[PDB]
């Protein structure tokens, strides 16, 4: 009967997390039929005490199938040791895991980097940012990340021992920098940090991360109310939530939920005969599991991934932050408008220049070559004469489009009939894909119309912008044409589909919201020169 060793920080500031994890593990094992035996060890408060628990655990257990460790510091220290002794290793409650041995250590905790990328969407609207972080590799990793992302805005980076909780100094340093947001890299001890900071006159918006969602923090809503934090987006509907609550008298937080999915999946692995470190690692690596944490996907390097959301502390409980959905849509609308504005300016400037050079030849080509470098979302740039014929292009590798008659393209007609700039609908281009063309008219020295200059955007223009914005949030953003045609959707099978073949309202209104089936929908519009696209965000 295989033995799994489980090292948790019982003798430490994170006692409560440790007991939660222990509870969840024991609950999980009782029901699964006990595919393995558990022995618990006390990792203590620092790295040495955890390395000692591991070494002791190895000395005392011959049939040791695996070692599970809680905390970024325990896990980073055990990782190379387990590898050397060829013991399968799982890290839980470990966002700042440092990997050196490829193919070793499976990790169920989403990393600092991913969580930091999401938190940055909120923090970017604060010009003065203070950080107070636990003095261990989780704190220091968050500090180093936040400092890299926000060089100018980060005005203070203070550490604290979570066992000692002597923070009067750090909080003095901090108040003296008049921060706009105070980021706490803290678990439950944040309720005390919050109290003292408010009593010390600090009025800054409090901000935290995954570990901060503890009952202590909610109880202290007198001080913590309004605090915004990033958190895994699993729902409460899983049977584990209720089983744990009924047995132990309180709801399990992240660490319980995580520890329950570890037992469930490891149990199944040890039943199926997987027993070597390589087999146990491969069990997880590349795989998707659905469980109490929701849908969990493991990369080839053994790291779990699952979506996060913004949450906030309120008087009545921990809540999903309503603000994030319109925020993400607006932030995306804004990046798109600024990209379009940049393109429009560059093309307008290029038209001014082509006035003296004409549209053909080496001087024209040079304007085109530069215009393309000025437009990172360009596929190419052309000039088009008064007849609607492409007469020049950069990059020159697309020289075959020269001579192509595009006088029948809808935007080209409009430019010819208005002698004003146009942004096309998403139409099939001679280059071989459905794209979007921005054109400005060109006039010679005497004011006579001589044609137009164009930037054609990349085939994946919208996707390349949108997918970065929505990365790891449980939402989708799509783009619709005025006539209802889908221009961009993360599911490409939908691209090109109409909605005349809430959709009706999206056609006629530039902004809106709605609900279908249960999903919420928000939309706005982006565009130029009378060509507007609808930008919609959906979420549960
Ligand atoms: C005991 C926890 C605060 C540790 C944790 O959540 C982490 O290291 O990522
Ligand atoms: N580069 C292009 C501009 C306008 N229309 C096209 O089909 N291609
Ligand atoms: Ca696998």
Q: Is any atom of ligand 1 closer than 6 Å to the C-beta of 332?
A: no
CATH of segment(s) 112-234+311-328: 3.40.50.2300
CB atoms within 10 A of CB 399: 11
Specify the ligand 1 atom closest to the Cα of 137: 8
Which ligand neighbours the alpha carbon of 409 most closely? 2
Counting atoms of ligand 2 from 1, which one is nearest the CA of 454?
A: 3
User: Can you list the alpha helix ranges (DSSP code H) found in 85-125?
Assistant: 112-123
Q: What's the CA gap between 68 and 66, in Å, rounded?
A: 7
Name the closest ligand to CA 47: 1
Query: Tokens at residue 166, please?
Result: 């002597």
The H or E element containing residue 61 is none
Give the C-alpha separation, 390 to 412, whole Å.
11
CA of 326 to the centre of ligand 3 (A): 37
The residues facing 230 across adjacent strands are 310
Q: Which CATH class is domain 331-460?
A: alpha beta
Q: Is 71 in the pocket of ligand 1 (CB under 6 A)?
A: yes
Q: Is 258 in the pocket of ligand 2 (CB under 6 A)?
A: no
Rounded Cα gap, residues 47 and 36, in angstroms:
27
Please count the residues of the chain: 540
Atom of ligand 2 nearest to the CA of 456: 1
Distant-in-sequence contacts of 224-229, Cβ < 8 A, 24+ apart: 224/190, 224/191, 224/194, 224/313, 225/313, 225/314, 225/315, 226/312, 226/313, 226/314, 227/190, 227/194, 227/312, 227/313, 228/122, 228/310, 228/311, 228/312, 228/321, 229/310, 229/311, 229/312, 229/313
User: Is the CB of residue 187 below 6 angstroms from any atom belonging to ligand 1?
Assistant: yes
Pocket test for ligand 1, best of 44, 186, 187 (most atoms within 8 A of CB): 187
- Indicate which technique resolved this structure: X-ray
Hey, whose CA ends up nearest to atom 4 of ligand 2? 437
Tokens of 143: 């500090």
Helix (H) or strand (E) holding 83: helix 72-84
Using the mean position of ligand 2's atoms as its centre, give its distance from the Cα of residue 364 in Å. Answer: 17
* 431 close to ligand 2 (CB < 6 Angstrom): yes
The reply to whether ligand 2 has any atom less than 6 angstroms from the CB of 75 is: no
Resolution (A): 2.0
Establish whether residue 457 lines the binding site of ligand 2, counting it when its CB lies within 6 angstroms of any ligand atom: no
């Amino acid at each position: 009967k295989p033995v799994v060793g489980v090292i948790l920080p019982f003798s430490s500031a994170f006692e409560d997390i440790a007991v939660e994890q222990q509870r969840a593990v024991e609950l999980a094992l009782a029901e699964s039929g006990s595919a393995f035996e558990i022995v618990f060890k006390d990792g203590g408060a620092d790295v040495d005490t955890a390395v000692q628990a591991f070494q002791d655990l190895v000395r005392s257990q011959e049939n040791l199938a695996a070692v599970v460790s809680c905390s970024s510091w325990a896990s980073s220290a055990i990782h190379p040791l387990a590898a050397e002794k060829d013991i399968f290793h799982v890290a839980i409650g470990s966002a700042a895991l440092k990997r050196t041995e490829p193919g070793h250590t499976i990790r169920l905790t989403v990393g600092v980097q991913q969580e930091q990328e999401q938190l940055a969407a909120y923090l970017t609207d604060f010009e003065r940012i203070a950080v107070l972080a636990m003095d261990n590799n989780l704190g220091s990793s968050w500090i180093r990340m936040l400092e890299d992302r926000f060089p100018k805005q980060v005005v203070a980076a203070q550490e604290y021992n979570p066992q000692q909780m002597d923070i009067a100094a750090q909080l003095a340093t901090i108040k003296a920098r008049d921060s706009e947001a105070l980021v706490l890299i803290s678990a439950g001890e944040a309720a005390t940090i919050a109290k003292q900071a408010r009593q010390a006159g600090i009025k800054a918006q409090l901000v935290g991360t995954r570990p901060i969602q503890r009952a202590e923090v909610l109880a202290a809503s007198a001080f913590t109310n309004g605090l915004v934090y990033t958190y895994p987006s699993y729902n409460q509907d899983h049977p584990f939530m209720s089983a744990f609550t009924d047995r132990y008298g309180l709801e399990p937080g992240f660490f319980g939920v995580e520890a329950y999915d570890l037992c469930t999946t490891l149990s199944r692995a040890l039943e199926q005969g997987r027993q070597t470190p390589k087999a146990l690692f491969e069990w997880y690596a590349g795989n998707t599991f659905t469980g109490a944490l929701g849908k969990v996907t493991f990369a080839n390097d053994g790291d779990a991934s699952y979506p996060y959301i913004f949450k906030k502390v309120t008087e009545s409980g921990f809540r999903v932050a309503e603000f994030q959905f319109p925020m993400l849509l607006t932030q995306t609308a804004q990046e798109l408008n600024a990209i379009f504005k940049d393109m429009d300016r560059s093309v307008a400037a290029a038209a001014e220049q082509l006035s003296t050079t004409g549209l053909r030849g080496d001087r024209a080509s040079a304007i085109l070559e530069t215009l393309f470098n000025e437009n990172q979302y360009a596929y190419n740039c052309v000039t088009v004469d008064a007849t609607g014929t492409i007469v020049n292009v950069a990059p020159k590798q697309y020289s075959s489009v020269i001579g192509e008659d595009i006088s029948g393209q809808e935007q080209i007609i409009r430019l010819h009939e208005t002698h004003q700039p146009v942004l096309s609908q998403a139409i099939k281009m001679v280059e071989g894909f459905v794209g979007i063309d921005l054109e400005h008219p060109v006039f010679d020295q005497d004011g006579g119309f001589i044609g137009s200059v164009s930037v054609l955007t990349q085939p994946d223009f919208f996707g390349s912008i949108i997918s970065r914005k929505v990365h790891n949030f449980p939402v989708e953003i799509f783009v619709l044409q005025r006539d209802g045609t889908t221009i961009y959707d993360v599911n490409a099978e939908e691209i090109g589909k109409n909605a005349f073949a809430i959709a009706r309202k999206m056609v006629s209104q530039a902004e809106g919201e709605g609900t279908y089936r249960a999903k919420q929908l928000l939309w706005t519009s982006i565009g130029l020169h009378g060509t507007n696209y609808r930008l919609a965000l959906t979420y549960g």
